[PDB]
Design a protein around this ligand. Structure first.
Ligand SMILES: [Cl-]
Ligand SMILES: [Cl-]
Ligand SMILES: [Cl-]
Ligand SMILES: [Cl-]
Ligand SMILES: [Rb+]
Ligand SMILES: [Rb+]
Ligand SMILES: [Rb+]
Ligand SMILES: [Rb+]
Ligand SMILES: [Rb+]
Ligand SMILES: [Rb+]
Ligand SMILES: [Rb+]
Ligand SMILES: [Rb+]
Ligand SMILES: [Rb+]
Ligand SMILES: [Rb+]
Ligand SMILES: [Rb+]
Ligand SMILES: [Rb+]
Ligand SMILES: [Rb+]
Lengths: 395, 395, 398, 394
């Protein structure tokens, strides 16, 4: 990092995270993303929506969303038609890479005010008919599930992410029981944070037109913890000897999250109060079926970029694609669980894939405040072999 | 200018195949892998294993699988360690990818970057949007993914062809003016083809026989010009009084293109011969249905970023989304046609929408060399109201 | 003409309950429904084994994704011998009655002695079609075609739904929204009254739906009759012409699942194995006219069947005029001069349901019950079908 | 004694290849064409004289309400005509004619048109679970031809596999089936060359609104290549399989129709009959052994007609597969010199709903050309059944 123009986070906001075909399933991904952008900008005293110059928004399963999901998010949030808008896809890391690109655009001097984040409506992912143009003369055909194909299946092995999670349990020696106790713990932390009001600030509730109106205030998944059923359920990907289950994996989910970034000159020009400063970031990648432990490369790289030692981080967000992913990255990096996902993680909160990268950053800012920490680091792995990480200082 | 230098050390593109034509058997990542591998084979002293990061445009990503850009990279033989992000700014995706690639070098997060774009419009699927919840009764629709995600402005739900007519009405271009432009740009592409002026930039594609092999060497569309038929055809979007036709518009096409970018340090370190220098860039946007003349904002912005006067430019690439688009931006900017698309444009060459931003840049470098120019500017409008532009200096 | 040919006797009949669309019976396929009705009807005949059945005619309209020869599947599923001749019949809504006619004819030409005939329909399991995947469709949104609409409810010629031609019938013969609404209410009450009186218990063969190892679910009643709500019925918007329509969904027939079967034997096999005939087929008549006028096609087929039978309209004790819509019952009663007090005495398809391939047999099965309950001898069943046709049959209770 | 039934005429379309020369036509268009052609051949019979229609059609999905009604009306028949579609899979076309003859014999009609049609090119695919939905997972589009035409219900196996059964059951090798296929292809091409199909085939006009097109020939017979046919791989069992696409019948489009009249109507209108229906027979056995169900139905039809097997001048035994004609010839003891004299379904095509009427149509042209008097046509059908009919030419 060192001597480049500083980048400040002046706000952040997220939708509640809805369950698959659940509370938010009637909204499109641009609708969720617009809602988060609008709510992030409303929090900045002295910054107008018309000051936003550029948007990078993550989104993975973009089929049937329409032209440029980010542009639709931005216009739907009331930004000016002059706003530059780009949609980003690095699968599960899309939301964080979007924020990195936003910070880079300020650093290279091409913008002073950037909104970045991500959105996903997994409920509204369609099915594909791939061969209607040239036809298929004879034989049964397939309707491809867009979630499986473009979100959850490794391209080279043609295996779903749960089988990569099983590789992870084998590679790093985590049993069914260890994965279940981790998942119970992270559900408990998410429920405790919920009940204590600790998500109230970051969440922007959604009002659904009515019957009268419906208001969605809370993330849908945390309440679902039942530890007896969790410990008793059959494994989801390998019969008999499997370790990965639907309880101890992240679910399929709907949601969006956004941050507002400004340059140092704009912070002073508009007399803005920054929430946090971006200190650095890192992307890394390894063998695609081992994407589960790519954060163990991206996190040290972000820390080096930021000029910060790992021990000085007060809180980590390690995205819980599966419970085994958190366990393996904690083991490889030597990070105690006492510093990880202090308000729960994606296993209990949900995982709307194009949004999760920005979602955990929003939650991390809340964790640092609630726990009186200064330095935080978010790390998220992604299908294909990659991971992205970011370091922030709460001001 | 006071930003670190970014050098183009090579570039390459596939031939551009017609819709369901010569390249319809190849997926978008197969096309992009081909372009990437070809561009790298040109750099004396740089290995594919030296590439650190990839940005690749792709608009209609449905059924391509996880992260199109990652599939392109691994398909081209790049290391599993490579950072890969897919970019969607509709028709400008390929150029915005290169911009993001240059910024990643400028902020020092990479020294070797491959950027470009790919599109297989032949293999864009149809979507079944409502199978998860089901539909109890009634005929149901199968959404054409090209119309939905490539060609229809999300706000108005109007095809871009209709907004091209709005352009012809707004700026006073008749059927005849657009047709005569179309014929000139076809003749320029045929002349360039016959003179071998595309031979360097095109990497021919060998299709293995299941039967004899097939080598695809040339762009499929330039030979289709029939001036008699082009002048007599019915309008394509407005009956009777319409001025936009399939012959004077861009076709639907398959192809990919890629550039290799290095830092100043890495150029000296490996003693690499640079082809060109990126001098600056600019993105702009306006009212979505006026996307046709967004380049009239992006081009001056890129020139100001580059510290270059419009008069200093030796050749322009203005992407021919429609003939009327090139006419209108030439009129608004005061650029004579003899400086524009000297080897023809997308009306005659084809328009694989995710690749065209990088395709025109590849062609631009070929025009500067063939015509002994120094300074070039590429500009490309995109659905939603946007445009991107980039300035290069041939070394 | 009939006396010059062998006699044909009905020795039993059975029907499943009629399920609502995606309702109580939606887990079963049309051959499972059909096999259930065949098996129930044969178990009623004392002195006759299922292996004595020689031929099967079975109606079914929307046969897509049902598999090879639905009738064969119903016959084998019911435990019939693999030597059984099986043919599926499609005369749209009349298919179940036309299958019975062809069964009767097959005995009368001497080509069989024991015939099972009826029909089946699972409208819940009718699929959607993708019509152009073989040759392709290079560019443009395409259509997933609802098989019920295409092959069941739309006139081929005009490409218009039957409800719109039910409207045509209403303007043709002067029946208001009020007159259809109040007839609908009456046939719902007749159906509910029959239900509460137990008058369907004999003809209905309840279906046992298996459990996940756990007792079993049992569908005993028709699902539609309980849904009568006279407030909502008179207040609902019309279904086919906004604002000025008379035909509504409550006074039309529903989409439904169900099957029905009768057993037919020649005069020789009756006396041979000593069987108790329930009824005798006295004659039948098919007729057809303008496709959009199918609603009044029973007014041609019913007289033709009576003439074939050598019986008078005033001699008939009960009529089953199938209620595709309330207006077709109104219209045919007006054209023929038949008073409602002799028509659909346990209710009709508006209240019971209209599994289209089965309904022609369903009304015959109910007709035999009406005659037993109301102490009658002569019944006439008549049913219109999309395309312009109708079929009618005349029975004498023994 | 029940009234006699006379065939006064019959016609059939050219048989088109799968997705071929007739794929632009729907099954009712093909069916209407064949009805109006057979009606044009009769002097003194007006189209308004037809009272009832029975038409076979198997894969009826997306054809619209009552294919037989559409065929009748498209052919110009009166809206008063009674129309029923019949499905006994491959026997549908012949079972309809049997039903039509019975409708005359019970006195309910004096003029019936019967036959069959199939457009396998235009059979759709099915999405079976859209009404209740499927929340997560890849889904199937079912090929209507496989599901409703070519797959036995209980075994869930394609008909090609039932034919490999018939080969192991009665002992016919890959070479014994391929030689028969070549012989039938050559028999088919000799009839075309000798004009022996031109009477029965009503050509179709596909006009340009573009150049005009007229299909007059059957598309399949010209495709014979004995070198390619001998050297292809098996289609249903690798390595050891004996059944292939060349020695099997194809997927095809086509229609055939016959005009039937009573004794009294023949006399009243002074019509000149082509043949007389003498008897018929339906039989069935184990579903996967349907290939040899004709060995039951053919005797039953000869029995019902009061003629013996050695009195038949020509047999049309439908060639669902080359092995099917070979097996049934072995069981009934029929010499091939008396079988499918102008070729069969393996060379001519097999539009399944129509073939039962198609082979009867061709039988009458065989009987006329070979100066024969007694013909028999039998046809197996998926599900385990078969239908047979005996005609005497007049
Ligand atoms: Cl990756
Ligand atoms: Cl835009
Ligand atoms: Cl009809
Ligand atoms: Cl059968
Ligand atoms: Rb604000
Ligand atoms: Rb302020
Ligand atoms: Rb809040
Ligand atoms: Rb979970
Ligand atoms: Rb190289
Ligand atoms: Rb080259
Ligand atoms: Rb063009
Ligand atoms: Rb019994
Ligand atoms: Rb009962
Ligand atoms: Rb109703
Ligand atoms: Rb005639
Ligand atoms: Rb002819
Ligand atoms: Rb063949």
């Amino acid at each position: 990092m060192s001597s480049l123009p500083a980048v400040y986070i002046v706000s952040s906001a997220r939708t509640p995270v809805g369950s698959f075909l659940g509370s938010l399933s009637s909204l499109t991904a641009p609708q969720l993303g617009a809602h988060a952008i609008k709510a992030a900008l409303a929090k900045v005293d002295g910054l107008k929506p018309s000051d936003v110059q550029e948007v990078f928004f993550g989104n993975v399963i973009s089929a049937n969303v329409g032209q440029n999901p980010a542009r639709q998010c931005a216009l739907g949030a009331g930004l000016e038609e002059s706003t530059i808008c780009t949609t980003v896809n690095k699968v599960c890391a899309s939301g964080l890479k979007a924020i990195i690109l936003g910070a880079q655009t300020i650093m290279t001097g091409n913008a002073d005010v950037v909104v970045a984040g991500g959105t996903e409506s997994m409920s509204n992912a369609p099915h594909y008919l791939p061969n209607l143009r040239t036809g298929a003369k004879y034989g049964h055909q397939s309707l491809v599930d867009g979630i499986m194909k473009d979100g959850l299946t490794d391209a080279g092995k043609q295996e779903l992410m749960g089988l990569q999670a099983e590789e992870c349990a084998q590679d790093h020696g985590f049993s069914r029981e260890q994965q279940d106790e981790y998942a119970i713990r992270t559900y408990e932390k998410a429920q405790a944070a919920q009940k204590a009001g600790l998500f109230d600030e970051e969440i922007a509730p959604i009002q659904l037109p009515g019957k009268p109106d419906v208001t969605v205030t809370q993330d849908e998944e945390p309440k679902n913890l039942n530890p007896e059923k969790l410990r008793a359920i059959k494994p989801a990907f390998i019969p008999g000897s499997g370790t990965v289950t639907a309880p101890n994996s992240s679910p399929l989910n709907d949601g969006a999250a956004a941050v507002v970034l400004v340059s140092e000159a704009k912070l002073k020009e508009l007399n803005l109060k920054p929430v946090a400063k971006i200190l650095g970031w890192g992307d890394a990648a390894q063998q695609p079926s081992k994407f589960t432990t790519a954060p163990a490369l991206a996190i040290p790289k972000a820390l080096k970029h930021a000029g910060v030692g790992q021990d000085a981080i007060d809180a980590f967000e390690i995205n819980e694609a599966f419970s085994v992913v958190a366990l393996a990255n904690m083991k490889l990096l030597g990070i105690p669980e006492e510093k990880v996902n202090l308000h729960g993680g994606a296993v209990a909160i949900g995982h709307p894939i194009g949004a999760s990268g920005a979602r955990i950053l929003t939650t991390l800012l809340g964790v640092l405040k609630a726990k009186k920490g200064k330095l935080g680091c978010a790390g998220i792995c992604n299908g294909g072999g990659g991971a992205s990480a970011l370091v922030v200082e709460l001001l």
